[PDB]
Design a protein around this nucleic acid. Structure first.
Ligand SMILES: Nc1nc2c(ncn2[C@@H]2O[C@H](COP(=O)(O)OP(=O)(O)OP(=O)(O)O)[C@@H](O)[C@H]2O)c(=O)[nH]1
Ligand SMILES: [Mg+2]
Ligand SMILES: [Mg+2]
Ligand SMILES: [Mg+2]
Ligand SMILES: [Zn+2]
Lengths: 49, 96, 27, 202, 456, 67, 93, 83, 48, 115
RNA sequence: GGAGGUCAACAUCAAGAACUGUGGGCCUUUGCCUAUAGAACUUAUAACGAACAUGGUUCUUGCCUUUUACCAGAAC
RNA sequence: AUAAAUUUUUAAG
């Protein structure tokens, strides 16, 4: 389910909201990925250093 | 006798075993006059003994009290950190 | 009780090693 | 390290009853008997076998001057390091010795001291399958709890004669302090209570 | 991230432990966080503490697997009294919110600019003020002076990154030019929050010498000039760094003064001595004693005083803190009915408690610390200690003790009291604290040490 | 399975007074309240599972240990 | 407590005595999917039955387990209560 | 009030209020009562900016059901009564 | 101990620990953290 | 006897101001205190050329040398000092002046400056 | 001759759960087997001490300019 | 339904 990568010093774990099997409100160190058109949030990007 | 025997007459011991210079020292004095942890440690140690034996003295003189005595040597034995300075020459004593 | 949380011991960690349960997230 | 056990021929204690004379009893099949000792935790089993042993043997190297007058009970049949530190009895251990009955005829006896913890009942089953009769050792204070019931049901199930011991009487007066009457009432309650579960005998 | 939190903690605790070595100590009690975190304008180091927080400790064995969440908090950093301190990450907006705001803002500016173009009007520069600091390009950058040149600057980022190779000194911000990107953050709010997180100026300056210089209010203090010299620092915070609650340390009275040092603090001795020189301690003592002897001279009329004679004082008594002796003695013309001892300000006194002839005064100076700056307690402690004691000699077992903190310029007197005294000593002392030349010589000389000017 | 820590829990909680023994004789057995085959059972992931399904848990685990 | 680097909530804190836990083989054995979580496994277990609940002990000792559960009952209140008396705490039989 | 000074909304206050709700029902009642207090009494003061904070801050609470949702019923849209 | 026996042998004055039995027992309750820390310290020395 | 020393044992009486008076009287009779001269270790900022052995003090060289308070006082009140340095090759004394108005030194008696 | 002593000297006090002597048989004194007598003090939740310090070497750390002095664990 | 608390100093260079 995960898609990992890292750029600069950021490490990013991309979970599509689909396969998370649960959607939980999470802290501010976690991005929400918003589609262009549907204006939805389809994936959470977890950030670490 | 150990101080003068070394040839240093300008370091005075008081009667509380504090070792103080009686003069400002030229450099070669400071070199000759550095005393190690043997001396200084033993100095601190006696200072403790003298201190307690004194408390009992002033009890004997009648000058103090019965209970104030026991409180006294309690205060010593706890506050040796503040009242002595043995903790300088062996820092291990910090455990006690 | 030390349940496996905290540090192996607080020596080099400079903190107090004081741990406390989190009232925040339970249910 | 592993156990505590004496290896020499010359250090084995000296058995005031003359071991040689005991081995002769083995020829008479009717004469020798097998008694196991079973009962719940801390009923005093092992320290009872201690009484028997140090009664029989004349000089034991394991007695400290301490345990000889002992504050701390000498536990002879313990024998394992793990059972010494664990404070418990684990692997069953017996002894064989001859002792005079009250009529002065001596008979040869094999004690099998079983462990008392209810997880080790596995090794009380052995003590039943072997022993000819079972001493069921009981605490007067604890009374007979469910595990005792299971010990008498297993005894009477395997066709093995029973005898009960009521142990730890010092804990009765020296702790609970019961008036002379009330203790006796308590004994009537226990002895009355054990016959209830022994159907064919009283 | 667990490790970077741990490393922030070790980092800050390590630098604080570096200033602590800067004198001699690791000791926690000497250095309460007010020392480090008060901004320079109050005379503290002014470092910015991000390490307090609390650090999620959850489940070493499992967190290798699930990401259990935060089940527990290990203590981040410590203290004697907790207080609290704000931490930077709260004062800087997260990236998400700034990119969102950037998108909405630049959309709005697109529209508004199309309003100025289509209607041939000019930007009000107020109409755009609401968003002025919003947006990652930071709208303000549009209006900077040099933009005409900057449009011909391109490739600035890669240049910034390759400044690693062509020069030694690092440039901690290599990811922005404040010219093109504006200024992406601000702090100053943090400043104020720390000052009130420690209890405000009023509690903070309880730690310093601010009360010793004599200045009544803070606002008029300019310091002198942004780097505080080290000596001036240890003076300014001295009554904490030197304090009587110290765990272990060896009391040593300074040479000619009554100041006590705990252990050895390197600068504090040179600075304090250069405050007290020319035997300024004795001069203070004999100054006060003398002036009180004058005010007692004038009042022989009302109080029925045969003679007011300051005795011949053994030379050392001024700075000897063990046992004292009477400075001024009193004598009864008729006879005196005194009361039980009290504080200077305690009102009700029954003067028929006792009847005596001679009274005596003492002036006991003490240089106080932040542990005990309360005088009256100290004064009653002394007076009871001596008057109960056999050794301390006084012409009659009735007297008055007058204590003074020269560090906080405070005073009090715990005496025996007969009619007429308190209305004298109150007013008179209230003058003397602002009067004597000596105490004035301090209050200027400490100002020389701390390098303070009163402006306005 | 619920007795993993029971004894010490008891013996401490009463400050050393008290005692416990766990023993297995009658060989009783009991249903586990869950339903052994269900797709929708809730897997708590580091928590003890809710009683509505403990059986789907136990089986989905044992099958992972075995194969 | 020391050898296992564990503390009784009132007991002392020591050093690890085996400073390296860091080595971990990535392997199927202890994986979460293969474990059933019932009861938390508090420390007091690991100190109580050290070889059982605690994987890979070293230099550990045997705790001594159990004692008889003292029933001792005494009277410090009245000096004139007899030595042998039936205390209301006891059951009536 | 503090969240309105932040100059932009932050997930911080959302996850804070969420972890605070689930602990005790008094905080349920607290956030409900404060929702009514804000929307009814106190809105007239806030400038259009701070409204951008409040809007999302209550959005995160409603959409994840902590609020709960029916408490939105207070809102009524009329030309006569609206702000 | 010295009490149950009713007979024994003299022990050197510094070998009677009066304060040991206090910190071997639990910390109790009302005590502020400052003394609980002291119980831990002393137990540590004892164990060593 | 520590280099950093907090206390100094004093005689049991020692009226300190009295010792200031008697010592103030003592200060006149001594040879050293009254020498009107001074000794300081220093450097040569402007380099040098000796006028005796034509030796070169190359740029900045340590010297044990002699400071003197000059009877001049720059402007109304500013201090001005005169320093002397002996040459390594020959026994010769060269002197300085410190101009407060013109920051650089100007020198005399036994040396010349390189340009 | 008994009681003692803030007297001394010389033995002995950590091990196959363990001491010593002696009788007899085999090998060739040792050693093994067998028989017999006596075993003070210290030991099983293990030890002479119902108590509790320091030092040396070697590793691991902790402070962190360097050495003494140190931080807390281990082995000898 | 939590009761989990590190330090701390002298000399020489
Ligand atoms: N009061 C009293 N206590 C006893 C008596 N006999 C044994 N105990 C105590 O009870 C505990 C059990 O004694 P043991 O015989 O050693 O234990 P046990 O019989 O071996 O118990 P198991 O190991 O389960 O067989 C011991 O710790 C004894 O102190 C007794 O006669 N009176
Ligand atoms: Mg047993
Ligand atoms: Mg060197
Ligand atoms: Mg050198
Ligand atoms: Zn020359």
């Amino acid at each position: 389910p995960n898609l990992l990568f890292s750029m600069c010093g950021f490490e990013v774990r991309i979970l599509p909201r689909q396969r998370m099997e649960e959607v939980v409100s999470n802290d501010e160190g976690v991005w929400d990925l918003v589609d262009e058109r549907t204006k939805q949030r389809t994936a959470k990007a977890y950030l670490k250093v | 006798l150990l101080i003068h025997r070394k040839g240093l007459t300008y370091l005075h011991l008081d009667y509380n075993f504090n070792l103080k210079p009686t003069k400002t020292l030229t450099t070669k004095e400071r070199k000759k006059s550095r005393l190690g942890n043997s001396f200084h440690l033993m100095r601190e140690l006696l200072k403790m003994m003298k201190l307690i034996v004194d408390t009992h003295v002033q009890f004997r003189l009648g000058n103090v009290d019965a209970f104030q005595l026991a409180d006294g040597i309690h205060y010593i034995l706890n506050h040796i950190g503040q009242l002595t300075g043995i903790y300088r020459y062996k820092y291990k004593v910090m455990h006690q | 009780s030390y349940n496996g949380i905290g540090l192996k011991s607080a020596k080099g960690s400079s903190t107090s090693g004081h741990v406390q349960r989190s009232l925040a997230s339970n249910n | 390290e592993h156990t505590i056990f004496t290896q020499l021929k010359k250090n084995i204690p000296k058995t005031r009853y003359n071991r040689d004379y005991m081995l002769s009893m083995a020829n008479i099949p009717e004469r020798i008997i097998n008694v196991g000792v079973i009962g719940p935790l801390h009923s005093g089993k092992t320290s009872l076998m201690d009484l028997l042993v140090i009664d029989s043997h004349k000089r034991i190297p394991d007695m400290s001057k301490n345990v000889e007058l002992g504050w701390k009970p000498l536990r002879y049949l313990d024998n394992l390091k793990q059972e010494i530190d664990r404070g418990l009895s684990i692997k069953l251990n017996g002894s064989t010795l001859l002792c005079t009955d009250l009529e002065s005829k001596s008979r040869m006896i094999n004690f099998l001291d079983a462990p008392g913890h209810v997880n080790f009942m596995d090794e009380t089953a052995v003590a039943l399958a072997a022993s000819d009769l079972v001493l069921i050792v009981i605490d007067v204070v604890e009374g007979v709890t469910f595990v005792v019931e299971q010990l008498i049901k297993q005894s009477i199930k395997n066709n093995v004669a029973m005898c009960f011991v009521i142990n730890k009487l010092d804990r009765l007066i020296l702790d609970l302090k019961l008036p002379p009457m009330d203790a006796y009432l308590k004994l009537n309650h226990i002895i009355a209570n054990i016959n209830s579960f022994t159907k064919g005998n009283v | 991230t667990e490790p970077l939190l741990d490393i922030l903690v070790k980092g800050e605790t390590r630098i604080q432990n570096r200033v602590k070595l800067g004198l001699n100590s690791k000791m926690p009690t000497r250095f309460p966080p007010a020392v480090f975190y008060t901004p320079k304008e109050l005379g503290g180091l002014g470092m910015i503490s991000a390490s307090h927080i609390l650090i999620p400790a959850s489940d070493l064995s499992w967190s290798k697997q699930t990401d259990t969440g935060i089940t527990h908090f290990r203590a981040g950093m410590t203290h004697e009294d907790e207080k609290l301190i704000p931490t930077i990450f709260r004062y800087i907006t997260t990236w998400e919110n700034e990119f969102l705001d950037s998108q909405r803002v630049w959309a709005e500016y697109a529209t508004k600019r199309q309003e100025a173009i289509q209607q041939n009007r000019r930007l009000a520069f107020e109409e755009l003020e609401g968003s002025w600091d919003r947006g990652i390009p930071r709208i303000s950058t549009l209006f900077q002076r040099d933009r005409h040149t900057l449009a011909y600057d391109r490739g600035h980022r890669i240049r910034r990154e390759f400044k690693q190779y062509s020069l030694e000194r690092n440039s901690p911000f290599w990811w922005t030019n404040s010219h093109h990107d504006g200024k992406l953050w601000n702090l100053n709010a943090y400043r104020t929050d720390v000052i009130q997180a420690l209890g405000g100026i009023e509690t903070i300056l309880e730690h310093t010498l601010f009360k010793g210089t004599g200045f009544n209010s803070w606002e008029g203090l300019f310091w002198e000039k942004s780097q505080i010299p080290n000596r001036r620092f240890t003076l300014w915070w001295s009554p904490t760094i030197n304090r009587a609650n110290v765990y272990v340390g060896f009391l040593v009275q300074l040479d000619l003064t009554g100041i006590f040092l705990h252990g050895k603090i390197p600068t504090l001795k040179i600075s304090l001595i250069q405050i007290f020189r020319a035997h300024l301690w004795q001069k203070i003592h004999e100054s006060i004693v003398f002036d009180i002897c004058q005010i007692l001279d004038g009042e022989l009329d009302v109080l029925q005083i045969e003679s007011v004679t300051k005795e011949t004082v053994h030379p050392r008594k001024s700075y000897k803190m063990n046992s004292s002796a009477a400075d001024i003695t009193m004598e009864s013309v008729h006879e005196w009915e005194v009361s039980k001892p009290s504080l200077l300000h305690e009102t009700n006194d029954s003067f028929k408690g006792l009847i005596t002839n001679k009274m005596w005064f003492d002036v006991q100076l003490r240089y106080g610390d932040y542990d005990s700056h309360d005088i009256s307690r100290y004064v009653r402690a002394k007076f009871l200690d001596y008057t109960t004691d056999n050794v301390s000699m006084y012409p009659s077992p009735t007297g008055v003790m007058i204590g003074i903190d020269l560090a906080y310029n405070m005073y009090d007197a715990y005496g025996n009291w007969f009619n007429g005294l308190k209305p004298l000593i109150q007013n008179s002392m209230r003058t003397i604290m602002k009067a004597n030349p000596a105490l004035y010589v301090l209050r200027e000389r400490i100002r020389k040490g701390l390098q303070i000017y009163q402006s306005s | 399975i619920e007795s993993a820590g029971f004894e010490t829990d008891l013996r401490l909680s009463t400050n050393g007074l008290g005692m416990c023994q766990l023993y297995f004789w009658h060989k009783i057995w009991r249903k586990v309240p869950g339903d052994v085959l269900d797709k929708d059972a809730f897997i708590p992931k580091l928590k003890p599972a809710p009683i509505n399904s403990l059986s789907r848990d136990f089986v989905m685990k044992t099958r992972r240990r075995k194969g | 407590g020391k050898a296992l680097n564990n503390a009784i909530p009132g007991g002392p804190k020591f050093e690890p005595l085996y400073p390296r836990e860091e080595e971990e083989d990535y392997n199927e054995f202890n994986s979460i999917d293969r474990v059933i979580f019932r009861v938390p496994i508090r420390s007091e277990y690991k100190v109580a039955f050290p070889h059982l609940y605690n994987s890979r002990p070293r230099s550990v000792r045997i705790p001594w387990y159990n004692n008889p559960v003292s029933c001792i009952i005494q009277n410090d209140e009245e000096y004139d209560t007899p030595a042998l008396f039936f205390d209301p705490s006891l059951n009536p039989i | 009030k503090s969240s309105l000074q932040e100059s932009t909304f932050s997930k911080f206050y959302s996850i804070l209020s969420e972890r605070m709700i689930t602990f005790h029902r008094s905080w349920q009642t607290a956030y409900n009562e404060t929702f009514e207090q804000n929307y009814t009494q106190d809105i007239e003061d806030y400038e259009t900016d701070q409204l951008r904070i409040l809007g999302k801050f209550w959005g995160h609470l409603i959409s994840y059901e902590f609020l709960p949702m029916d408490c939105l019923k207070i809102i009524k849209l009329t030309e006569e009564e609206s702000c | 101990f010295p009490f149950n026996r009713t007979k024994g042998k003299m022990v050197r004055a510094q070998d009677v620990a009066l304060a040991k039995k206090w910190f071997l027992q639990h910390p109790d309750e009302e005590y502020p953290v400052k003394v609980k820390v002291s119980y831990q310290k002393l137990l540590k020395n004892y164990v060593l | 006897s520590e280099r950093k020393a907090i206390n100094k044992y004093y005689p049991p009486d020692y009226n300190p101001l009295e010792a200031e008076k008697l010592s103030r009287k003592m200060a006149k009779k001594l040879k050293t205190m009254n020498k009107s001269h001074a000794s300081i270790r220093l450097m040569t900022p402007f380099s040098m050329r000796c006028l005796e052995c034509n030796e070169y003090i190359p740029k900045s060289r340590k010297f044990n040398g002699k400071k003197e308070l000059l009877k001049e006082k720059y402007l109304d009140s500013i201090k001005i000092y005169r320093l002397t340095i002996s040459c390594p090759r020959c026994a010769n004394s060269i002197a300085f002046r410190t101009d407060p108005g013109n920051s650089d030194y100007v020198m005399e008696v036994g040396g010349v400056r390189n340009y």
